[PDB]
Amino acid sequence: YSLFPNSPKWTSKVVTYRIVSYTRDLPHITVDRLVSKALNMWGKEIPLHFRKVVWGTADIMIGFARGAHGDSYPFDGPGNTLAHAFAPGTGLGGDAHFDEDERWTDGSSLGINFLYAATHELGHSLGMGHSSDPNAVMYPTYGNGDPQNFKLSQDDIKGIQKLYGK
Numbered sequence: 029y030s031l032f033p034n035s036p037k038w039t040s041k042v043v044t045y046r047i048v049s050y051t052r053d054l055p056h057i058t059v060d061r062l063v064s065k066a067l068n069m070w071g072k073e074i075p076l077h078f079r080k081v082v083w084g085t086a087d088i089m090i091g092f093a094r095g096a097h098g099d100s101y102p103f104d105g106p107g108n109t110l111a112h113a114f115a116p117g118t119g120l121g122g123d124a125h126f127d128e129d130e131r132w133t134d135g136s137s138l139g140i141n142f143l144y145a146a147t148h149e150l151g152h153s154l155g156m157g158h159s160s161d162p163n164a165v166m167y168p169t170y171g172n173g174d175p176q177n178f179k180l181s182q183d184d185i186k187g188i189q190k191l192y193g194k
């Protein structure tokens with residue numbers, strides 16, 4: 029595992045999150061259930077706790093976007109970069125954006141598995157950098173293992189606990 033330079037991390041017991049926009053590929057309830065599932069995958073290993081808010085600012089802002097969307101990291105259409113997220117901090121810090129040009133799926137169709145992608149991006153939102161281990165969720169590319177049958181590897185778990193303790 030690797031952390032971001034200077035090891036930024038949320039310095040609070042509770043971290044809020046808000047899903048600002050949705051994809052047209054999935055029911056809204058599925059995105060909510062899956063973001064929750066994803067946050068709690070990391071949540072179970074550490075002392076942090078998460079709370080969803082539906083208006084205003086939250087530490088982690090989640091949204092879907094195609095192309096340019098204000099943050100200077102324009103998406104690029106289907107394929108290539110699937111999504112991106114930012115190290116803990118204020119403003120853009122902690123946010124996770126998913127490329128709406130991708131065919132997102134919960135796993136029952138051909139496309140990009142949103143739970144797998146969200147676990148990876150929220151790992152970045154919590155402070156995780158990339159892994160050299162092809163099997164870790166934090167590995168830089170999608171599809172080495174099985175998007176529909178996976179779990180955090182010992183490498184992912186070691187890194188998150190190095191950042192927030194057990």
Ligand SMILES: CC(C)C[C@H](CC(=O)O)C(=O)N[C@H]1Cc2cn(c3ccccc23)CCCCCCNC1=O
Pocket residue numbers: 107108109110111112113144145148149152167168169170171
């Ligand atoms: C892990 C994931 C959920 C989030 C990451 C983004 C991130 O690290 O947060 C991601 O999108 N990685 C690219 C990395 C990537 C692979 N290639 C690329 C070609 C161009 C640009 C990027 C890539 C080769 C071609 C395949 C393109 C489709 C799959 N893309 C990827 O795996």
Ligand SMILES: [Ca+2]
Pocket residue numbers: 086087088089117118119120121122123
């Ligand atoms: Ca933020």
Ligand SMILES: [Ca+2]
Pocket residue numbers: 103104105106107108109110111127129130
């Ligand atoms: Ca893309």
Ligand SMILES: [Zn+2]
Pocket residue numbers: 097099101112125
């Ligand atoms: Zn963005």
Ligand SMILES: [Zn+2]
Pocket residue numbers: 148152158166167168
């Ligand atoms: Zn990444």
